[PDB]
Design a protein around this ligand. Structure first.
Ligand SMILES: Cc1cc2nc3c(=O)[nH]c(=O)nc-3n(C[C@H](O)[C@H](O)[C@H](O)COP(=O)(O)OP(=O)(O)OC[C@H]3O[C@@H](n4cnc5c(N)ncnc54)[C@H](O)[C@@H]3O)c2cc1C
Ligand SMILES: Cc1cc2nc3c(=O)[nH]c(=O)nc-3n(C[C@H](O)[C@H](O)[C@H](O)COP(=O)(O)OP(=O)(O)OC[C@H]3O[C@@H](n4cnc5c(N)ncnc54)[C@H](O)[C@@H]3O)c2cc1C
Ligand code: SF4
Ligand code: SF4
Ligand code: SF4
Ligand code: SF4
Ligand code: SF4
Ligand code: SF4
Ligand code: SF4
Ligand code: SF4
Ligand code: SF4
Ligand code: SF4
Ligand code: SF4
Ligand code: SF4
Lengths: 662, 662
């Protein structure tokens, strides 16, 4: 073997901590080293040219670069090694900047030089034993899955379908739309939410390239970037679509959404779409604008009285004995768009959320103010049904809170939606006054500051003080809000008819279960984690899975849609190519060393190992597609019958031996 | 003709303002009307089914729907009309909600009913004269253009190229990278900006599907969604790349970035990359990490001394007589990513930006604190070169300002970058204190609040008061910052060694010229406008043009990258299909009525009209692809020889006549 050692200065970031000349001379005197040389910026085009010229001149077998981190510049120098007539995987780095210079800057120079010599020696020892690998290319199934039917899921599904990829849209609830379907008007443009979204819901429902699967969950996921074998649970909806009815043999059809079933059902239960304010029968739709207008049956609350089937009549859409059906679907990529729920604000006892009647939260206020809600769009007091004339908005309710009860982060949109609600009350109830108890108004987006200016102009009162506690008047049920006006410098006691809490948001229910099924990690905040927080906010570390929407962190509908289309583009990249290259770190069983004990088989989380027949002997078989290169099996096998392709035992032991060489 | 009139209630939004029964009976008695009928939600699946059943039963020629706005529900009801055996364009709406109900709610009912009858009559009169149109499909060139080589432009270009579309990346400056290349570290994770971006710059420079054209501008654009004939100005760089040198015949090569030319050049000028703090020769690169390492010549400042060519020698890369070359490129879609510049804060005289030495702005501070900047990464006072020990940060400098000098909006990232700079000074200069004069700390993004907590923990002082004015001490050159501590309730006089202004951002220089070349409008704020502010933040109203990055409004690098990938996906949608359908509103010349006067030819902004030979007669010829359907020509032509396809004179005059019918 013939190895070249190229030591970067990183423009004095390394030459200001060690003696590069001494490191280079030591590399020259090292065994197996053909050429040792240095340059100011080895990651720059003259640096790659230097590598390539050295390879051609000295007939180099391998290249060692004493530079920054591999996690930073493996692709660069692997491509530089390829261009030059070598394999990309005859290359090895020695991290002498982020683990030598930046940590041994001060007052210790010959010690850092000795550390650099040791790292270069270990790198040369490994590279003298590296050999050729070729990355595995795997086919990509031409379908995609989008979990979540909110705005982010619908946008991602429409984007993929219009790019031409067949797409599955999984929604746990009987309708698509998400939270934006519950919103009444939207900041800062004050458009009606359903009006702007109903068009896109119709597009999703009609698109031939979208397989809209509502009221369905994801039981299990196995596979990788190539093929994800996703098992879906089709929950017993209880009612048949026209297509399914015709398939089952009923010519007359399935559900046409007439409503006779819910007209005759005698069970009455709260509506989760209306946050519980409104009744709905056992057979029901959330609202009149649901996209699949198919009238789910709630089997936890149905009493099987059979009146619904008599009402449905010849359509015969209702099957009261339906059971959870399971389907297995193979997909190439997956997009996660699970959204969010409101943090449980009844834990903050000083604001009497559950204990005082006239304290509500912002999604209940949005349903109360919507014209399609339980009221006729008239905001009335829950305690007595009278119209409020003073409304308080507690901003930051459970947010930027380090006490362990609330969330330590900002929920991003709660300042903006509180401004919207203040405007809505001041314009819908004549003479009503809105009080916002705020602590940093955050109107940062496009036209947001102008919206804030307009709300103040219309006459909302802004009191800069976090609410301390809330007391309920025993007779009028009015709410006494106690805080300090920090700018005025005095305590205040504002008595309002209705108190609205701008509660924090948290990941939806079951989101952690789903992201563990797909292999995604979590952030410090508890939201799903992205591949690189700056330059890759959509992709995750597990290949073939992408994030979209509030599930990655709270955001407004504009930012959510931008993120969703970005995720759709990233998921389309490998589908359009049809190939994708895996990293050749796989385990390879050496059969004439395997003894067939089968003990390694249970050490693989991905089930890549199995016992099979080769030449009569029972040996172990690696599904090289399923292997991920962790190395657990190869670190276990006592006989050394498992070889890890770029981190083989001879290579690692050569590194150890070179460290102890003196 | 046989017309069906279907009147929506919109769920009492219309039935609570007029008498729907009376409107329906009037429609029945109208001439040409075969069936008139009503439904609660005509935009819902039972509503489309009602339309289709009526069409089939009554053999309807056309459909009139008395409902919400056409701008909201033309696609829905055109598709409903298609499904049913009609042309989509035999359909016409009568807006009786947003222009009758919501504006005549109160105390006037029979008047709103009469208005509704009039609108229905006019709609029926037009629809009785509509006839069949088929949308024009035009081919899409399989290339794309990205104007701007910042993070948003580079991300969009990489996304399109990896989707497989050939892409042009136009950058006015000699290098790609943008502002993020000038940033030293990044909030909220404190990563080195160049370290995280250099990998992506290398990808862009090496991608075979990207035609990176640096130091080039867009002279003119003509065409449409199908083919954009974009003319580029290749400014005289003065130095030849190796490829261009080999093409011109120099075998030895072009520019290898050795630096001898700038080592011998005698001219010294300010470096715009370093915001003017640092010298650079007439032949130069911005920084050592520029992607095309090709050493532009600054011809406005070169004295043609010829020392550079002697230094370059046999490489012969320098051509001092080079001129602006022009190239015409045909592209299918275009992505605009022009970025931003800092608002001129010398106009705010109370903060002595240009008049006091030790007052700088945030990009100059970022260059001063970077280790690759004019200093060795050491922040020193401009007045005397001494190290500061107290640094003030004036947040909101020129922002949320309604006086007409500053900007009325929030610049989004200035609170976050000021926190980053406070951290950087407190960690780089031991014992230095950072004072932030703030008015609403805005840490809204992911991990931003935690970053704010950490900065306060490390010990930055947060004084809630907008700076009133700044006085300079005559001898020490120290800056006396005068404001009020609004929370403390007292005026303050903080004397700092260095004052940093967190200035507002504004659209880059020439951005308005470029967006007028491409046909994009502007926002209230002055940034480029998007198609729909909520559900389409990337596309513009002009088809085939998409927005990405700060050019649409200020944003952090994460949001910018999400927007850029969203724009790349939207630009890929029509390229992957290869077809795109234009709206059949074109002008069609009736030749045996045209007299060949040629006067209409100059009334077309798009040059779709011309005089041509047909049957010996000189008549007018419409390029139906170039026509956009405005109607100026057809409203001009005295002889009525131009027909507008869905808004013909007989149709409009029938509407007028029906209005005056009693
Ligand atoms: C009170 C309030 C007012 C607001 N007002 C505005 C406003 O005026 N303007 C604005 O721009 N933004 C507003 N927002 C923010 C806005 O709601 C969000 O930006 C947006 O809804 C994000 O949508 P999403 O698709 O990411 O999540 P969601 O809308 O929550 O959608 C997630 C979807 O995924 C489904 N789902 C969840 N888990 C699973 C699972 N395991 N399997 C399958 N499906 C699953 C859910 O049922 C849901 O349908 C407001 C928020 C609140 C709370
Ligand atoms: C002082 C400061 C500190 C910041 N710190 C951070 C931070 O720590 N973290 C963070 O996330 N964000 C930070 N930001 C914000 C960040 O810089 C932006 O989010 C980001 O640079 C947006 O990039 P862009 O590509 O849209 O625009 P730009 O980076 O400005 O890129 C636009 C590019 O287009 C080119 N161009 C312009 N007009 C034309 C034209 N007509 N033809 C051709 N090319 C053209 C320009 O030359 C430029 O190369 C900071 C901003 C400032 C001012
Ligand atoms: S390869 Fe790493 S150490 Fe060398 S110049 Fe580039 S970033 Fe610096
Ligand atoms: S009665 Fe039958 S067809 Fe009508 S809504 Fe109920 S389930 Fe659907
Ligand atoms: S079976 Fe009875 S309880 Fe159940 S949905 Fe039908 S009517 Fe309601
Ligand atoms: S967005 Fe506003 S109300 Fe919501 S947590 Fe952040 S600062 Fe508080
Ligand atoms: S590879 Fe090792 S552990 Fe696995 S079956 Fe063979 S001998 Fe047993
Ligand atoms: S290295 Fe071994 S244990 Fe790890 S995934 Fe591959 S086969 Fe399974
Ligand atoms: S078509 Fe328009 S008016 Fe009719 S229900 Fe739908 S939104 Fe309302
Ligand atoms: S001397 Fe010639 S080859 Fe070297 S940097 Fe200058 S122009 Fe390029
Ligand atoms: S011609 Fe003279 S002034 Fe111009 S770049 Fe060359 S050395 Fe500098
Ligand atoms: S981001 Fe912060 S500093 Fe910048 S304008 Fe907005 S509030 Fe002021
Ligand atoms: S269409 Fe009319 S205006 Fe145009 S050339 Fe013919 S007669 Fe003249
Ligand atoms: S309608 Fe007439 S003037 Fe307008 S674009 Fe078409 S041809 Fe030109």
């Amino acid at each position: 073997p013939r190895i070249g050692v190229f030591v970067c200065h990183c423009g004095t970031n390394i030459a200001g901590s060690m003696s590069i000349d001494d490191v280079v001379n030591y590399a020259k005197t090292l065994p197996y080293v053909a050429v040792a040389d240095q340059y100011q910026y080895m990651c720059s085009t003259p640096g790659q040219k230097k590598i390539d010229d050295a390879i051609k001149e000295y007939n180099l077998t391998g290249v060692v670069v004493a530079a920054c981190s591999p996690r930073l510049h493996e692709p660069t120098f692997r491509t530089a090694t390829k261009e030059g007539g070598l394999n990309p995987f005859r290359f090895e780095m020695a991290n002498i900047r982020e683990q030598n210079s930046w940590v041994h800057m001060h007052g210790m120079w010959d010690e850092a030089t000795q550390k650099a010599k040791d790292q270069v020696r270990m790198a040369v020892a490994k590279a003298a034993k590296l050999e050729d690998l070729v990355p595995k290319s795997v086919p990509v199934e031409k379908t995609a899955m989008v979990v979540g039917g909110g705005v982010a899921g619908m946008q991602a599904a429409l984007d993929l379908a219009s790019a031409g990829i067949k797409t599955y849209l999984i929604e746990r609830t009987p309708t698509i739309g998400g939270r934006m379907s519950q919103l009444d008007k939207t900041f800062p443009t004050l458009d009606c939410s359903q009006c702007i979204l109903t068009p896109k819901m119709v597009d999703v429902g009609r698109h031939p390239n979208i397989e809209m699967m509502t009221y369905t969950e994801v039981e299990k996921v196995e596979g990788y970037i190539g093929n994800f074998d996703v098992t879906l649970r089709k929950k017993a909806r209880g009612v048949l679509t026209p297509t399914e009815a015709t398939a089952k043999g009923i010519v007359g059809g399935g559900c046409n959404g007439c409503g006779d079933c819910s007209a005759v059902c005698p069970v009455i239960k709260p509506n989760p779409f209306e946050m519980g304010m409104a009744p709905r029968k056992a057979i029901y739709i959330y609202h009149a604008q649901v996209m699949p207008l198919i009238y789910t049956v709630d089997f936890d609350s149905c009493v099987k009285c059979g009146l619904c089937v008599e009402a449905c009549g010849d359509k015969k859409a209702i099957d009261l004995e339906m059971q959870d059906e399971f389907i297995t679907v193979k997909v190439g990529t997956a997009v996660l768009a699970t959204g969010y729920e409101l943090f449980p604000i009844e834990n903050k006892r000083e604001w009497g959320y559950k204990q005082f009647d006239n304290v509500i939260n912002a999604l209940e206020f949005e349903r109360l103010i919507c014209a399609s809600g339980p009221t006729g769009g008239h905001l009335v007091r829950p305690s007595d049904g009278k119209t409020p004339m003073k409304v308080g908005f507690v901003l930051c309710a459970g947010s930027r809170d380090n006490t362990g009860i609330g969330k330590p982060y900002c929920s991003r949109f709660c300042c903006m939606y509180s401004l919207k609600h203040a405007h809505q009350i001041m314009e819908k109830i004549p003479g009503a006054v809105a009080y916002l108890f705020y602590m940093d108004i955050r109107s940062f987006g496009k036209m947001y500051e102008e919206f804030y200016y307009r709300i103040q102009h219309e006459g909302a009162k802004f009191i800069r003080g976090r609410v301390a506690n809330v007391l309920e008047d025993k007779e009028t049920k009015n709410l006494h809000v106690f805080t300090e006006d920090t700018l005025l410098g005095r305590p205040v006691d504002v008595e309002v008819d209705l108190l609205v809490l701008a509660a924090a948001v948290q990941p939806n229910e079951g989101a952690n279960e789903l992201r563990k099924k797909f292999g995604v990690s979590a952030s410090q905040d508890g939201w799903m984690l992205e591949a690189h927080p700056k330059l890759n906010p959509c992709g995750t570390t597990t290949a073939g899975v992408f994030l979209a929407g509030v599930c990655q962190g709270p955001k407004d509908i504009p930012d959510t849609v931008a993120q969703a289309e970005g995720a759709a583009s990233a998921a389309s990249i490998p589908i359009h190519m049809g190939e994708v290259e895996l990293e050749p770190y796989f385990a390879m069983c050496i059969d004439e060393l395997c003894a067939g004990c089968g003990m390694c088989v249970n050490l693989c989380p991905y089930s890549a190992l199995s016992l099979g027949e080769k030449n009569g002997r029972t040996v172990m078989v690696v599904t090289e597609a399923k292997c991920k290169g962790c190395g657990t099996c190869g670190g276990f096998c006592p006989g050394g019958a498992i070889k890890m392709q770029h981190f083989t035992t001879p290579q690692i032991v050569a590194q150890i031996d070179a460290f102890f060489a003196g």
